[PDB]
Amino acid sequence: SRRWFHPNITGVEAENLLLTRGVDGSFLARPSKSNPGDFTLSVRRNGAVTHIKIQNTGDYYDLYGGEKFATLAELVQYYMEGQLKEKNGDVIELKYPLNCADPTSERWFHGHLSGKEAEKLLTEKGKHGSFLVRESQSHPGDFVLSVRTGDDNDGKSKVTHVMIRCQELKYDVGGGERFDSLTDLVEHYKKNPMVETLGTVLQLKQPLNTTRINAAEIESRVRELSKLQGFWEEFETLQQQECKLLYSRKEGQRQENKNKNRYKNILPFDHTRVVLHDGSDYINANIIMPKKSYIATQGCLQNTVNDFWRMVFQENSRVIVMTTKEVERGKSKCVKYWPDEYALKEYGVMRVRNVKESAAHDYTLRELKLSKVGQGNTERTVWQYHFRTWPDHGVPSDPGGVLDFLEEVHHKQESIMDAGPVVVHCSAGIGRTGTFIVIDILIDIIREKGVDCDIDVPKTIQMVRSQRSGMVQTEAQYRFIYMAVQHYIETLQR
Numbered sequence: 299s300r301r302w303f304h305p306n307i308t309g310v311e312a313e314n315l316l317l318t319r320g321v322d323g324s325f326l327a328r329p330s331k332s333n334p335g336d337f338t339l340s341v342r343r344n345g346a347v348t349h350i351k352i353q354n355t356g357d358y359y360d361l362y363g364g365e366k367f368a369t370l371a372e373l374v375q376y377y378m379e380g381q382l383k384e385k386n387g388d389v390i391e392l393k394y395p396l397n398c399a400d401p402t403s404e405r406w407f408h409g410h411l412s413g414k415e416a417e418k419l420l421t422e423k424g425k426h427g428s429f430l431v432r433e434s435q436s437h438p439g440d441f442v443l444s445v446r447t448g449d450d451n452d453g454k455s456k457v458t459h460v461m462i463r464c465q466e467l468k469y470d471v472g473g474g475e476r477f478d479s480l481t482d483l484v485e486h487y488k489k490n491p492m493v494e495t496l497g498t499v500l501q502l503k504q505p506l507n508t509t510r511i512n513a514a515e516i517e518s519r520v521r522e523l524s525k526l527q528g529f530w531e532e533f534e535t536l537q538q539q540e541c542k543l544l545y546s547r548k549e550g551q552r553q554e555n556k557n558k559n560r561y562k563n564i565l566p567f568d569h570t571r572v573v574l575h576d577g578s579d580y581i582n583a584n585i586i587m588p589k590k591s592y593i594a595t596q597g598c599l600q601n602t603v604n605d606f607w608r609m610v611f612q613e614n615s616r617v618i619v620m621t622t623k624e625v626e627r628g629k630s631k632c633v634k635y636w637p638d639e640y641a642l643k644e645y646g647v648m649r650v651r652n653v654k655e656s657a658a659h660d661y662t663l664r665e666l667k668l669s670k671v672g673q674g675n676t677e678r679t680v681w682q683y684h685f686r687t688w689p690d691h692g693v694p695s696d697p698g699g700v701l702d703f704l705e706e707v708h709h710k711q712e713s714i715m716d717a718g719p720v721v722v723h724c725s726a727g728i729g730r731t732g733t734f735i736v737i738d739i740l741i742d743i744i745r746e747k748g749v750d751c752d753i754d755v756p757k758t759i760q761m762v763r764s765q766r767s768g769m770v771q772t773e774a775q776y777r778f779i780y781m782a783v784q785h786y787i788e789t790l791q792r
């Protein structure tokens with residue numbers, strides 16, 4: 299599962315791997331190291347290696363010659379389970395994933411860690427089933443499998459250390475099968491746990507949590523992740539978990555809804571999709587939640603504007619968040635679904651009325667009045683916040699611009715009690731849309747609790763990714779999330 303992604307590798311090493319231990323059809327995904335949002339799909343074909351470029355400017359994974367996908371896993375699953383081909387007839391086959399042996403992108407692997415900290419973190423934050431793998435203390439090359447077992451200083455639990463000999467580029471626990479990587483060793487003993495001779499089972503339930511910190515400790519944790527980087531290693535470890543999020547998207551793949559998606563492969567999950575009553579029922583949108591919830595949808599197509607306002611009306615949405623311009627990178631991202639100032643336009647049975655626009659520095663607020671065409675139908679105020687400062691590529695260099703944009707959107711949601719979920723959307727609705735939702739979630743936690751409780755950015759992103767595919771796209775957006783939370787704390791401290 300996502301073993302085909304080699305995080306620490308250059309192009310010269312990928313050509314040697316596919317030509318040495320790979321056959322025709324063998325493929326791997328490698329990240330362009332110092333080029334942001336540039337990935338390469340290296341496939342062996344006709345004895346040579348073909349490198350297909352994948353660009354991610356912060357909105358989607360753009361595969362040259364293919365389509366646009368939410369994650370690399372959905373990119374791989376789509377061609378191993380459509381088809382990819384060059385501009386000149388010849389087809390490219392994705393057949394055999396060339397597995398990676400680098401464990402630095404795994405949650406349980408720490409490395410250069412001692413039994414002092416291993417037993418310490420497993421005794422404080424630990425829980426029955428928690429485990430970790432660290433570089434060996436006395437045998438340079440080996441590793442130690444520390445497992446906590448039992449209950450929830452009563453002599454209840456314990457920490458059993460399991461030596462993992464590393465010999466001949468294979469990993470063994472000192473008896474039996476010898477695996478090609480530490481991941482293969484942990485995955486084998488996750489299914490079939492070890493049993494000590496006296497009847498205790500070394501079950502590897504969940505990895506040890508090390509990404510949760512106090513919301514006042516945010517300035518230090520960023521300083522540790524800033525340079526040796528920890529930001530990159532903590533993000534790639536999050537990326538290695540997206541293969542667990544390949545859930546069914548059948549409703550988005552139906553022939554009745556092929557044209558209702560701006561990108562035919564970036565589709566909503568079935569278990570969280572937004573269904574539309576009255577009238578079809580489809581719209582590329584998902585329901586996000588941690589109370590206050592969200593709706594994350596794509597940029598409206600010209601044949602989905604009527605469905606967009608049926609969603610806002612039926613779900614009783616009073617706040618809309620637009621995080622992209624009308625046209626960016628020379629291509630259309632979101633059609634104009636809102637009337638101009640001091641005007642009214644009718645979208646199907648709905649009616650939107652622009653009362654007054656307020657042009658701020660970083661965004662534009664529009665006071666809209668939504669109502670269905672009917673006799674006793676009264677309007678209700680829907681506020682559209684249009685963030686215009688966000689650059690075409692990457693993230694803004696100042697979190698304060700996005701910080702002021704969120705707390706103002708937040709206060710508009712409190713002004714209405716019967717309000718529903720906030721509608722956040724960009725181009726595909728996964729990149730900036732995901733970054734805005736996660737930051738607001740982590741901040742809504744902070745403003746309610748203060749600065750004396752816990753926050754977990756990696757767990758929050760994975761929790762949101764399980765509701766819509768590929769939320770928070772690039773590592774720049776991941777780092778910007780920490781900066782926005784760090785910046786919100788800084789204003790509360792003063």
Ligand SMILES: CC1(N)CCN(c2nc3[nH]nc(-c4cccc(Cl)c4)c3c(=O)[nH]2)CC1
Pocket residue numbers: 401402403404405406407408409506507508509531532533534535536537539756757760
């Ligand atoms: C030293 C080191 N090799 C291991 C720890 N480490 C890390 N990086 C992560 N990124 N994302 C997550 C995550 C994903 C889903 C749920 C949860 Cl609770 C966390 C995560 C995580 O657990 N550890 C940094 C690198």
